mmCIF file with all atom_site columns, N, CA and C in Angstrom:
data_model
loop_
_atom_site.group_PDB
_atom_site.id
_atom_site.type_symbol
_atom_site.label_atom_id
_atom_site.label_alt_id
_atom_site.label_comp_id
_atom_site.label_asym_id
_atom_site.label_entity_id
_atom_site.label_seq_id
_atom_site.pdbx_PDB_ins_code
_atom_site.Cartn_x
_atom_site.Cartn_y
_atom_site.Cartn_z
_atom_site.occupancy
_atom_site.B_iso_or_equiv
_atom_site.pdbx_formal_charge
_atom_site.auth_seq_id
_atom_site.auth_comp_id
_atom_site.auth_asym_id
_atom_site.auth_atom_id
_atom_site.pdbx_PDB_model_num
ATOM 1   N N  . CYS A 1 1  ? 44.896 109.273 15.691 1.00 19.55 ? 1  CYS A N  1
ATOM 2   C CA . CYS A 1 1  ? 43.561 108.503 15.227 1.00 19.55 ? 1  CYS A CA 1
ATOM 3   C C  . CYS A 1 1  ? 43.127 107.553 15.922 1.00 19.55 ? 1  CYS A C  1
ATOM 4   N N  . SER A 1 2  ? 42.414 107.162 16.671 1.00 19.22 ? 2  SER A N  1
ATOM 5   C CA . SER A 1 2  ? 41.044 107.464 17.452 1.00 19.22 ? 2  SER A CA 1
ATOM 6   C C  . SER A 1 2  ? 41.754 106.632 18.803 1.00 19.22 ? 2  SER A C  1
ATOM 7   N N  . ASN A 1 3  ? 42.465 106.010 18.799 1.00 20.28 ? 3  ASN A N  1
ATOM 8   C CA . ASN A 1 3  ? 42.957 105.094 19.901 1.00 20.28 ? 3  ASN A CA 1
ATOM 9   C C  . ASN A 1 3  ? 42.452 105.599 20.913 1.00 20.28 ? 3  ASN A C  1
ATOM 10  N N  . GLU A 1 4  ? 42.456 106.009 21.963 1.00 18.55 ? 4  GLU A N  1
ATOM 11  C CA . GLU A 1 4  ? 41.608 106.668 23.452 1.00 18.55 ? 4  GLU A CA 1
ATOM 12  C C  . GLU A 1 4  ? 41.667 107.700 24.176 1.00 18.55 ? 4  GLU A C  1
ATOM 13  N N  . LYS A 1 5  ? 42.788 108.239 23.612 1.00 17.23 ? 5  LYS A N  1
ATOM 14  C CA . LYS A 1 5  ? 43.341 109.800 24.338 1.00 17.23 ? 5  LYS A CA 1
ATOM 15  C C  . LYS A 1 5  ? 42.043 111.111 24.010 1.00 17.23 ? 5  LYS A C  1
ATOM 16  N N  . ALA A 1 6  ? 40.757 110.236 23.453 1.00 17.67 ? 6  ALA A N  1
ATOM 17  C CA . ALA A 1 6  ? 39.878 111.859 23.191 1.00 17.67 ? 6  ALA A CA 1
ATOM 18  C C  . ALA A 1 6  ? 39.306 112.474 24.275 1.00 17.67 ? 6  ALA A C  1
ATOM 19  N N  . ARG A 1 7  ? 38.702 112.367 25.344 1.00 17.72 ? 7  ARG A N  1
ATOM 20  C CA . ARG A 1 7  ? 38.291 113.346 26.135 1.00 17.72 ? 7  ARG A CA 1
ATOM 21  C C  . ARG A 1 7  ? 38.955 112.714 27.717 1.00 17.72 ? 7  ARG A C  1
ATOM 22  N N  . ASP A 1 8  ? 38.242 111.533 27.672 1.00 17.72 ? 8  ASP A N  1
ATOM 23  C CA . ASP A 1 8  ? 38.603 110.684 29.043 1.00 17.72 ? 8  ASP A CA 1
ATOM 24  C C  . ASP A 1 8  ? 40.334 110.786 29.266 1.00 17.72 ? 8  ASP A C  1
ATOM 25  N N  . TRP A 1 9  ? 40.877 110.263 30.573 1.00 16.11 ? 9  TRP A N  1
ATOM 26  C CA . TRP A 1 9  ? 42.163 110.526 31.329 1.00 16.11 ? 9  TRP A CA 1
ATOM 27  C C  . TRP A 1 9  ? 43.024 109.888 30.341 1.00 16.11 ? 9  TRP A C  1
ATOM 28  N N  . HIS A 1 10 ? 43.812 110.353 30.113 1.00 18.15 ? 10 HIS A N  1
ATOM 29  C CA . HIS A 1 10 ? 45.102 109.306 28.841 1.00 18.15 ? 10 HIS A CA 1
ATOM 30  C C  . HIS A 1 10 ? 45.171 108.194 30.429 1.00 18.15 ? 10 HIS A C  1
ATOM 31  N N  . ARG A 1 11 ? 45.834 107.148 29.845 1.00 20.79 ? 11 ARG A N  1
ATOM 32  C CA . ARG A 1 11 ? 46.319 105.798 30.565 1.00 20.79 ? 11 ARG A CA 1
ATOM 33  C C  . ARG A 1 11 ? 46.786 106.539 31.129 1.00 20.79 ? 11 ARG A C  1
ATOM 34  N N  . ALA A 1 12 ? 47.735 107.464 30.970 1.00 18.08 ? 12 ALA A N  1
ATOM 35  C CA . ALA A 1 12 ? 48.658 107.987 31.923 1.00 18.08 ? 12 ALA A CA 1
ATOM 36  C C  . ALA A 1 12 ? 48.213 109.192 32.451 1.00 18.08 ? 12 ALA A C  1
ATOM 37  N N  . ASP A 1 13 ? 47.226 109.335 32.601 1.00 19.58 ? 13 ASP A N  1
ATOM 38  C CA . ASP A 1 13 ? 46.261 110.883 33.695 1.00 19.58 ? 13 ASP A CA 1
ATOM 39  C C  . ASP A 1 13 ? 45.528 109.981 34.689 1.00 19.58 ? 13 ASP A C  1
ATOM 40  N N  . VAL A 1 14 ? 45.186 108.946 33.866 1.00 21.13 ? 14 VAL A N  1
ATOM 41  C CA . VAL A 1 14 ? 44.888 107.436 35.235 1.00 21.13 ? 14 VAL A CA 1
ATOM 42  C C  . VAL A 1 14 ? 45.665 106.973 36.600 1.00 21.13 ? 14 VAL A C  1
ATOM 43  N N  . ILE A 1 15 ? 46.540 106.902 36.337 1.00 20.89 ? 15 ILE A N  1
ATOM 44  C CA . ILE A 1 15 ? 47.350 106.495 36.881 1.00 20.89 ? 15 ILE A CA 1
ATOM 45  C C  . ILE A 1 15 ? 48.221 107.679 37.679 1.00 20.89 ? 15 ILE A C  1
ATOM 46  N N  . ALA A 1 16 ? 48.848 108.633 36.550 1.00 19.16 ? 16 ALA A N  1
ATOM 47  C CA . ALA A 1 16 ? 50.053 109.072 36.863 1.00 19.16 ? 16 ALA A CA 1
ATOM 48  C C  . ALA A 1 16 ? 48.848 110.070 38.002 1.00 19.16 ? 16 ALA A C  1
ATOM 49  N N  . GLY A 1 17 ? 47.867 110.426 37.040 1.00 20.12 ? 17 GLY A N  1
ATOM 50  C CA . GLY A 1 17 ? 46.687 111.462 38.732 1.00 20.12 ? 17 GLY A CA 1
ATOM 51  C C  . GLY A 1 17 ? 47.219 110.770 39.751 1.00 20.12 ? 17 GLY A C  1
ATOM 52  N N  . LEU A 1 18 ? 46.673 108.970 39.848 1.00 21.00 ? 18 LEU A N  1
ATOM 53  C CA . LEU A 1 18 ? 46.103 108.314 40.618 1.00 21.00 ? 18 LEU A CA 1
ATOM 54  C C  . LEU A 1 18 ? 46.976 108.243 42.128 1.00 21.00 ? 18 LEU A C  1
ATOM 55  N N  . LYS A 1 19 ? 48.380 107.241 40.901 1.00 21.40 ? 19 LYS A N  1
ATOM 56  C CA . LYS A 1 19 ? 49.204 107.452 41.482 1.00 21.40 ? 19 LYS A CA 1
ATOM 57  C C  . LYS A 1 19 ? 50.231 108.389 42.437 1.00 21.40 ? 19 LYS A C  1
ATOM 58  N N  . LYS A 1 20 ? 50.048 110.071 41.752 1.00 21.81 ? 20 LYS A N  1
ATOM 59  C CA . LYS A 1 20 ? 49.791 110.737 42.459 1.00 21.81 ? 20 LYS A CA 1
ATOM 60  C C  . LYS A 1 20 ? 49.823 111.366 43.349 1.00 21.81 ? 20 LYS A C  1
ATOM 61  N N  . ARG A 1 21 ? 49.292 109.987 44.213 1.00 19.88 ? 21 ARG A N  1
ATOM 62  C CA . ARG A 1 21 ? 49.157 109.819 45.561 1.00 19.88 ? 21 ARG A CA 1
ATOM 63  C C  . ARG A 1 21 ? 49.959 108.771 46.107 1.00 19.88 ? 21 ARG A C  1
ATOM 64  N N  . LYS A 1 22 ? 49.634 108.032 45.876 1.00 17.67 ? 22 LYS A N  1
ATOM 65  C CA . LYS A 1 22 ? 49.781 106.244 46.692 1.00 17.67 ? 22 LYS A CA 1
ATOM 66  C C  . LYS A 1 22 ? 48.967 105.166 45.927 1.00 17.67 ? 22 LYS A C  1
ATOM 67  N N  . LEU A 1 23 ? 48.510 105.476 44.745 1.00 18.91 ? 23 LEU A N  1
ATOM 68  C CA . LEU A 1 23 ? 47.779 104.051 44.188 1.00 18.91 ? 23 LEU A CA 1
ATOM 69  C C  . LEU A 1 23 ? 48.775 103.500 43.194 1.00 18.91 ? 23 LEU A C  1
ATOM 70  N N  . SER A 1 24 ? 47.730 102.229 42.313 1.00 22.22 ? 24 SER A N  1
ATOM 71  C CA . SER A 1 24 ? 48.361 101.952 41.315 1.00 22.22 ? 24 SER A CA 1
ATOM 72  C C  . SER A 1 24 ? 47.820 100.694 40.821 1.00 22.22 ? 24 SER A C  1
ATOM 73  N N  . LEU A 1 25 ? 46.930 101.074 39.858 1.00 19.73 ? 25 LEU A N  1
ATOM 74  C CA . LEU A 1 25 ? 46.017 99.631  39.055 1.00 19.73 ? 25 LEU A CA 1
ATOM 75  C C  . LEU A 1 25 ? 46.683 98.250  39.538 1.00 19.73 ? 25 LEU A C  1
ATOM 76  N N  . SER A 1 26 ? 47.371 98.339  40.490 1.00 23.94 ? 26 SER A N  1
ATOM 77  C CA . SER A 1 26 ? 48.063 96.616  40.725 1.00 23.94 ? 26 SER A CA 1
ATOM 78  C C  . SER A 1 26 ? 47.431 96.324  41.904 1.00 23.94 ? 26 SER A C  1
ATOM 79  N N  . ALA A 1 27 ? 47.450 97.571  43.178 1.00 26.85 ? 27 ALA A N  1
ATOM 80  C CA . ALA A 1 27 ? 46.872 97.696  44.337 1.00 26.85 ? 27 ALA A CA 1
ATOM 81  C C  . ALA A 1 27 ? 45.247 97.986  44.643 1.00 26.85 ? 27 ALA A C  1
ATOM 82  N N  . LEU A 1 28 ? 44.647 98.522  43.950 1.00 27.34 ? 28 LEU A N  1
ATOM 83  C CA . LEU A 1 28 ? 43.325 98.693  43.784 1.00 27.34 ? 28 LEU A CA 1
ATOM 84  C C  . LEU A 1 28 ? 42.877 97.219  42.823 1.00 27.34 ? 28 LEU A C  1
ATOM 85  N N  . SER A 1 29 ? 43.689 96.540  42.828 1.00 26.54 ? 29 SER A N  1
ATOM 86  C CA . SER A 1 29 ? 42.836 95.384  41.976 1.00 26.54 ? 29 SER A CA 1
ATOM 87  C C  . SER A 1 29 ? 42.969 94.483  43.240 1.00 26.54 ? 29 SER A C  1
ATOM 88  N N  . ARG A 1 30 ? 44.289 93.899  44.137 1.00 25.52 ? 30 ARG A N  1
ATOM 89  C CA . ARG A 1 30 ? 44.134 93.398  44.550 1.00 25.52 ? 30 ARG A CA 1
ATOM 90  C C  . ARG A 1 30 ? 43.415 93.530  46.043 1.00 25.52 ? 30 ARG A C  1
ATOM 91  N N  . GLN A 1 31 ? 43.387 94.922  46.117 1.00 26.32 ? 31 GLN A N  1
ATOM 92  C CA . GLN A 1 31 ? 42.588 95.358  47.175 1.00 26.32 ? 31 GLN A CA 1
ATOM 93  C C  . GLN A 1 31 ? 41.558 94.445  46.707 1.00 26.32 ? 31 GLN A C  1
ATOM 94  N N  . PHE A 1 32 ? 40.626 94.243  46.694 1.00 25.76 ? 32 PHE A N  1
ATOM 95  C CA . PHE A 1 32 ? 38.791 94.338  45.835 1.00 25.76 ? 32 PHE A CA 1
ATOM 96  C C  . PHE A 1 32 ? 39.204 92.767  46.244 1.00 25.76 ? 32 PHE A C  1
ATOM 97  N N  . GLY A 1 33 ? 39.872 92.344  45.275 1.00 27.76 ? 33 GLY A N  1
ATOM 98  C CA . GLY A 1 33 ? 40.521 90.502  44.963 1.00 27.76 ? 33 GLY A CA 1
ATOM 99  C C  . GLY A 1 33 ? 40.892 90.048  43.767 1.00 27.76 ? 33 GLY A C  1
ATOM 100 N N  . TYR A 1 34 ? 39.247 91.088  42.429 1.00 23.42 ? 34 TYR A N  1
ATOM 101 C CA . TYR A 1 34 ? 39.569 91.087  41.264 1.00 23.42 ? 34 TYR A CA 1
ATOM 102 C C  . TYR A 1 34 ? 41.436 91.318  40.598 1.00 23.42 ? 34 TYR A C  1
ATOM 103 N N  . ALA A 1 35 ? 41.400 90.116  39.635 1.00 22.05 ? 35 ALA A N  1
ATOM 104 C CA . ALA A 1 35 ? 42.901 89.652  39.279 1.00 22.05 ? 35 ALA A CA 1
ATOM 105 C C  . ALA A 1 35 ? 43.175 90.690  38.685 1.00 22.05 ? 35 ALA A C  1
ATOM 106 N N  . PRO A 1 36 ? 43.978 91.651  38.666 1.00 23.92 ? 36 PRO A N  1
ATOM 107 C CA . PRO A 1 36 ? 44.489 92.785  37.718 1.00 23.92 ? 36 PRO A CA 1
ATOM 108 C C  . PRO A 1 36 ? 44.030 92.781  36.675 1.00 23.92 ? 36 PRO A C  1
ATOM 109 N N  . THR A 1 37 ? 43.569 91.538  35.210 1.00 21.52 ? 37 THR A N  1
ATOM 110 C CA . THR A 1 37 ? 43.491 91.233  34.254 1.00 21.52 ? 37 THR A CA 1
ATOM 111 C C  . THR A 1 37 ? 41.439 92.205  34.437 1.00 21.52 ? 37 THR A C  1
ATOM 112 N N  . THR A 1 38 ? 40.924 91.957  35.497 1.00 17.25 ? 38 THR A N  1
ATOM 113 C CA . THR A 1 38 ? 39.873 92.638  35.512 1.00 17.25 ? 38 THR A CA 1
ATOM 114 C C  . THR A 1 38 ? 40.169 94.680  35.201 1.00 17.25 ? 38 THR A C  1
ATOM 115 N N  . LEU A 1 39 ? 40.515 94.697  35.925 1.00 20.35 ? 39 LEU A N  1
ATOM 116 C CA . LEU A 1 39 ? 40.375 96.064  36.549 1.00 20.35 ? 39 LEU A CA 1
ATOM 117 C C  . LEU A 1 39 ? 40.973 96.882  35.481 1.00 20.35 ? 39 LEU A C  1
ATOM 118 N N  . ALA A 1 40 ? 42.467 96.409  35.205 1.00 16.51 ? 40 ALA A N  1
ATOM 119 C CA . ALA A 1 40 ? 43.491 96.710  33.625 1.00 16.51 ? 40 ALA A CA 1
ATOM 120 C C  . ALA A 1 40 ? 42.197 96.708  32.519 1.00 16.51 ? 40 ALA A C  1
ATOM 121 N N  . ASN A 1 41 ? 41.630 95.779  31.890 1.00 18.56 ? 41 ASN A N  1
ATOM 122 C CA . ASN A 1 41 ? 40.415 96.358  30.797 1.00 18.56 ? 41 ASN A CA 1
ATOM 123 C C  . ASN A 1 41 ? 39.869 96.866  30.983 1.00 18.56 ? 41 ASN A C  1
ATOM 124 N N  . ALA A 1 42 ? 39.330 96.786  32.676 1.00 19.72 ? 42 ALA A N  1
ATOM 125 C CA . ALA A 1 42 ? 37.599 97.322  33.037 1.00 19.72 ? 42 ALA A CA 1
ATOM 126 C C  . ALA A 1 42 ? 37.539 99.020  32.462 1.00 19.72 ? 42 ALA A C  1
ATOM 127 N N  . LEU A 1 43 ? 39.344 98.995  31.584 1.00 19.04 ? 43 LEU A N  1
ATOM 128 C CA . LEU A 1 43 ? 38.901 100.493 30.741 1.00 19.04 ? 43 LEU A CA 1
ATOM 129 C C  . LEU A 1 43 ? 38.030 100.506 29.709 1.00 19.04 ? 43 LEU A C  1
ATOM 130 N N  . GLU A 1 44 ? 37.832 99.713  29.239 1.00 18.67 ? 44 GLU A N  1
ATOM 131 C CA . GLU A 1 44 ? 37.224 99.521  27.918 1.00 18.67 ? 44 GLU A CA 1
ATOM 132 C C  . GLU A 1 44 ? 35.692 98.621  28.158 1.00 18.67 ? 44 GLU A C  1
ATOM 133 N N  . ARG A 1 45 ? 35.652 97.523  28.652 1.00 19.45 ? 45 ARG A N  1
ATOM 134 C CA . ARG A 1 45 ? 34.352 97.001  29.075 1.00 19.45 ? 45 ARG A CA 1
ATOM 135 C C  . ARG A 1 45 ? 33.819 97.745  29.594 1.00 19.45 ? 45 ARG A C  1
ATOM 136 N N  . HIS A 1 46 ? 32.549 97.383  29.095 1.00 19.16 ? 46 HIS A N  1
ATOM 137 C CA . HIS A 1 46 ? 30.824 98.106  30.226 1.00 19.16 ? 46 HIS A CA 1
ATOM 138 C C  . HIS A 1 46 ? 30.504 97.322  31.193 1.00 19.16 ? 46 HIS A C  1
ATOM 139 N N  . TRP A 1 47 ? 31.685 98.193  32.714 1.00 18.59 ? 47 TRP A N  1
ATOM 140 C CA . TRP A 1 47 ? 31.517 97.779  33.737 1.00 18.59 ? 47 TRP A CA 1
ATOM 141 C C  . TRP A 1 47 ? 31.364 98.632  34.835 1.00 18.59 ? 47 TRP A C  1
ATOM 142 N N  . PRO A 1 48 ? 31.010 99.743  35.260 1.00 20.49 ? 48 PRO A N  1
ATOM 143 C CA . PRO A 1 48 ? 31.302 101.108 35.514 1.00 20.49 ? 48 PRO A CA 1
ATOM 144 C C  . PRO A 1 48 ? 31.569 100.597 37.204 1.00 20.49 ? 48 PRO A C  1
ATOM 145 N N  . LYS A 1 49 ? 31.031 99.708  37.173 1.00 20.48 ? 49 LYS A N  1
ATOM 146 C CA . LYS A 1 49 ? 31.412 99.028  38.632 1.00 20.48 ? 49 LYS A CA 1
ATOM 147 C C  . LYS A 1 49 ? 32.568 99.081  39.053 1.00 20.48 ? 49 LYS A C  1
ATOM 148 N N  . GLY A 1 50 ? 34.010 98.322  38.412 1.00 17.74 ? 50 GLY A N  1
ATOM 149 C CA . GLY A 1 50 ? 35.492 98.810  38.208 1.00 17.74 ? 50 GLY A CA 1
ATOM 150 C C  . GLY A 1 50 ? 35.375 99.959  38.255 1.00 17.74 ? 50 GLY A C  1
ATOM 151 N N  . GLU A 1 51 ? 35.137 101.131 37.323 1.00 14.15 ? 51 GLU A N  1
ATOM 152 C CA . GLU A 1 51 ? 35.464 102.443 37.698 1.00 14.15 ? 51 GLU A CA 1
ATOM 153 C C  . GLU A 1 51 ? 35.112 103.269 39.092 1.00 14.15 ? 51 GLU A C  1
ATOM 154 N N  . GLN A 1 52 ? 33.909 102.819 39.568 1.00 14.78 ? 52 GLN A N  1
ATOM 155 C CA . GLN A 1 52 ? 33.837 102.801 41.354 1.00 14.78 ? 52 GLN A CA 1
ATOM 156 C C  . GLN A 1 52 ? 35.204 102.489 42.033 1.00 14.78 ? 52 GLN A C  1
ATOM 157 N N  . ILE A 1 53 ? 35.514 101.095 41.436 1.00 15.35 ? 53 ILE A N  1
ATOM 158 C CA . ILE A 1 53 ? 36.859 101.051 42.809 1.00 15.35 ? 53 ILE A CA 1
ATOM 159 C C  . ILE A 1 53 ? 38.122 102.383 43.008 1.00 15.35 ? 53 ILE A C  1
ATOM 160 N N  . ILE A 1 54 ? 38.586 102.497 41.170 1.00 15.76 ? 54 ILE A N  1
ATOM 161 C CA . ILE A 1 54 ? 39.549 103.902 41.424 1.00 15.76 ? 54 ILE A CA 1
ATOM 162 C C  . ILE A 1 54 ? 38.561 104.378 41.524 1.00 15.76 ? 54 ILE A C  1
ATOM 163 N N  . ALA A 1 55 ? 37.461 105.445 41.198 1.00 15.21 ? 55 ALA A N  1
ATOM 164 C CA . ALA A 1 55 ? 36.814 106.798 41.830 1.00 15.21 ? 55 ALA A CA 1
ATOM 165 C C  . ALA A 1 55 ? 37.060 106.410 43.729 1.00 15.21 ? 55 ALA A C  1
ATOM 166 N N  . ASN A 1 56 ? 36.758 105.471 43.755 1.00 14.44 ? 56 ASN A N  1
ATOM 167 C CA . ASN A 1 56 ? 36.676 105.166 45.464 1.00 14.44 ? 56 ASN A CA 1
ATOM 168 C C  . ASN A 1 56 ? 37.928 105.922 45.824 1.00 14.44 ? 56 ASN A C  1
ATOM 169 N N  . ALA A 1 57 ? 38.743 105.881 45.190 1.00 14.10 ? 57 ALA A N  1
ATOM 170 C CA . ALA A 1 57 ? 40.165 105.913 45.661 1.00 14.10 ? 57 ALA A CA 1
ATOM 171 C C  . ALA A 1 57 ? 40.404 107.027 45.558 1.00 14.10 ? 57 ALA A C  1
ATOM 172 N N  . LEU A 1 58 ? 39.934 107.629 45.101 1.00 10.84 ? 58 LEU A N  1
ATOM 173 C CA . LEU A 1 58 ? 40.033 109.305 45.370 1.00 10.84 ? 58 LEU A CA 1
ATOM 174 C C  . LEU A 1 58 ? 38.395 110.480 46.105 1.00 10.84 ? 58 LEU A C  1
ATOM 175 N N  . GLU A 1 59 ? 37.817 109.311 46.308 1.00 13.13 ? 59 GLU A N  1
ATOM 176 C CA . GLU A 1 59 ? 36.411 109.577 47.101 1.00 13.13 ? 59 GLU A CA 1
ATOM 177 C C  . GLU A 1 59 ? 35.915 110.581 46.315 1.00 13.13 ? 59 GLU A C  1
ATOM 178 N N  . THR A 1 60 ? 35.982 110.598 44.741 1.00 13.57 ? 60 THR A N  1
ATOM 179 C CA . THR A 1 60 ? 35.043 111.343 43.634 1.00 13.57 ? 60 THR A CA 1
ATOM 180 C C  . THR A 1 60 ? 33.984 109.736 43.259 1.00 13.57 ? 60 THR A C  1
ATOM 181 N N  . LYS A 1 61 ? 33.158 110.897 42.024 1.00 17.55 ? 61 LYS A N  1
ATOM 182 C CA . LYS A 1 61 ? 32.789 109.806 41.395 1.00 17.55 ? 61 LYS A CA 1
ATOM 183 C C  . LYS A 1 61 ? 33.517 109.327 39.695 1.00 17.55 ? 61 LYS A C  1
ATOM 184 N N  . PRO A 1 62 ? 33.009 108.362 39.130 1.00 16.47 ? 62 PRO A N  1
ATOM 185 C CA . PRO A 1 62 ? 33.864 107.696 37.515 1.00 16.47 ? 62 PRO A CA 1
ATOM 186 C C  . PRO A 1 62 ? 33.236 109.186 36.918 1.00 16.47 ? 62 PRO A C  1
ATOM 187 N N  . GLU A 1 63 ? 33.002 109.718 37.133 1.00 15.81 ? 63 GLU A N  1
ATOM 188 C CA . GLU A 1 63 ? 31.581 110.885 36.625 1.00 15.81 ? 63 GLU A CA 1
ATOM 189 C C  . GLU A 1 63 ? 32.965 112.330 36.464 1.00 15.81 ? 63 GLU A C  1
ATOM 190 N N  . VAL A 1 64 ? 33.911 111.820 36.998 1.00 15.43 ? 64 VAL A N  1
ATOM 191 C CA . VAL A 1 64 ? 35.623 113.292 36.715 1.00 15.43 ? 64 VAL A CA 1
ATOM 192 C C  . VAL A 1 64 ? 36.004 112.372 35.784 1.00 15.43 ? 64 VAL A C  1
ATOM 193 N N  . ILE A 1 65 ? 36.610 111.291 36.028 1.00 13.64 ? 65 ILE A N  1
ATOM 194 C CA . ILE A 1 65 ? 37.265 110.352 35.335 1.00 13.64 ? 65 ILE A CA 1
ATOM 195 C C  . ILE A 1 65 ? 36.628 110.751 34.220 1.00 13.64 ? 65 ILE A C  1
ATOM 196 N N  . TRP A 1 66 ? 35.351 109.660 33.250 1.00 15.04 ? 66 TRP A N  1
ATOM 197 C CA . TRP A 1 66 ? 35.142 109.878 32.344 1.00 15.04 ? 66 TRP A CA 1
ATOM 198 C C  . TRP A 1 66 ? 34.123 110.861 32.032 1.00 15.04 ? 66 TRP A C  1
ATOM 199 N N  . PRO A 1 67 ? 34.277 112.334 32.013 1.00 14.87 ? 67 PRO A N  1
ATOM 200 C CA . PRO A 1 67 ? 33.045 113.568 31.095 1.00 14.87 ? 67 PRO A CA 1
ATOM 201 C C  . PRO A 1 67 ? 32.411 113.054 30.300 1.00 14.87 ? 67 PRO A C  1
ATOM 202 N N  . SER A 1 68 ? 33.783 113.411 29.100 1.00 12.85 ? 68 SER A N  1
ATOM 203 C CA . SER A 1 68 ? 32.626 113.415 27.651 1.00 12.85 ? 68 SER A CA 1
ATOM 204 C C  . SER A 1 68 ? 31.987 112.472 27.590 1.00 12.85 ? 68 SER A C  1
ATOM 205 N N  . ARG A 1 69 ? 31.519 111.147 28.623 1.00 13.00 ? 69 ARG A N  1
ATOM 206 C CA . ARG A 1 69 ? 31.057 109.430 28.091 1.00 13.00 ? 69 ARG A CA 1
ATOM 207 C C  . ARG A 1 69 ? 29.097 110.013 28.976 1.00 13.00 ? 69 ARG A C  1
ATOM 208 N N  . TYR A 1 70 ? 29.435 110.608 30.078 1.00 15.31 ? 70 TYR A N  1
ATOM 209 C CA . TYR A 1 70 ? 28.295 111.050 30.794 1.00 15.31 ? 70 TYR A CA 1
ATOM 210 C C  . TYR A 1 70 ? 27.382 112.115 30.176 1.00 15.31 ? 70 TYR A C  1
ATOM 211 N N  . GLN A 1 71 ? 26.654 112.730 30.883 1.00 14.65 ? 71 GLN A N  1
ATOM 212 C CA . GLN A 1 71 ? 25.940 113.639 30.745 1.00 14.65 ? 71 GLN A CA 1
ATOM 213 C C  . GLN A 1 71 ? 24.707 114.542 32.355 1.00 14.65 ? 71 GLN A C  1
ATOM 214 N N  . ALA A 1 72 ? 25.410 115.158 32.900 1.00 15.11 ? 72 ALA A N  1
ATOM 215 C CA . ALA A 1 72 ? 24.686 115.468 34.522 1.00 15.11 ? 72 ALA A CA 1
ATOM 216 C C  . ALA A 1 72 ? 23.632 114.574 35.547 1.00 15.11 ? 72 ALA A C  1
ATOM 217 N N  . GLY A 1 73 ? 24.473 112.337 33.666 1.00 17.06 ? 73 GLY A N  1
ATOM 218 C CA . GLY A 1 73 ? 24.005 111.918 35.121 1.00 17.06 ? 73 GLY A CA 1
ATOM 219 C C  . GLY A 1 73 ? 24.866 111.518 36.472 1.00 17.06 ? 73 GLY A C  1
ATOM 220 N N  . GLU A 1 74 ? 23.911 110.731 37.699 1.00 17.42 ? 74 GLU A N  1
ATOM 221 C CA . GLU A 1 74 ? 24.330 110.862 38.967 1.00 17.42 ? 74 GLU A CA 1
ATOM 222 C C  . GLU A 1 74 ? 25.815 109.514 38.929 1.00 17.42 ? 74 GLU A C  1
#
């Protein structure tokens, strides 16, 4: 039913996968300053700079957590 578990990392695939080490959206949020609401709703509002915050934690690219959304893009 639409929802959001399409091709992107499920809501738990994001935190479960990241937190698999020692990360939590509440920590990445206050670590830069943006309140938790910003980072949270950063999963739907067009704002790839907030995705860099999360991907920055895995030292990877946001294109890895949202594949079917980009296309060979950099």
